[PDB]
């Protein structure tokens, strides 16, 4: 739109989030230890 306008969401970022391979981890300073996020234990894709 305009140069001064706020930055639009990146389509690359949207696609990367959709693929769901960004790494999320348990918090270091949470007691008791947090559960494993559902992303960290997903299985490998069946097709290369």
């Amino acid at each position: 739109g305009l140069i001064s306008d706020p930055v639009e969401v990146d389509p690359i970022q949207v696609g990367r989030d959709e693929a769901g391979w960004v790494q999320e981890l348990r918090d270091r300073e949470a007691w008791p230890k947090q559960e494993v996020p559902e992303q960290a234990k997903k299985p490998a894709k069946v097709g290369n």
Binding site: R16, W21, V22, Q23, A44, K45, V46, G47, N48
Partner: protein, 55 residues
Amino acid sequence: NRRDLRDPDRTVIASELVEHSFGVTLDKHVYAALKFTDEQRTLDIRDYTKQVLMP
């Protein structure tokens, strides 16, 4: 797979090989940002390398 010897049937169980994959991505932007007014840049700072860049 294994089958009995001299079996009357001769069917053979095919084994298909499967290749898996996973993604590696850049996701963080680690930075350190400093700001100095002209008053701080002129008077307070006496050696830029040893007071700003190294820390």
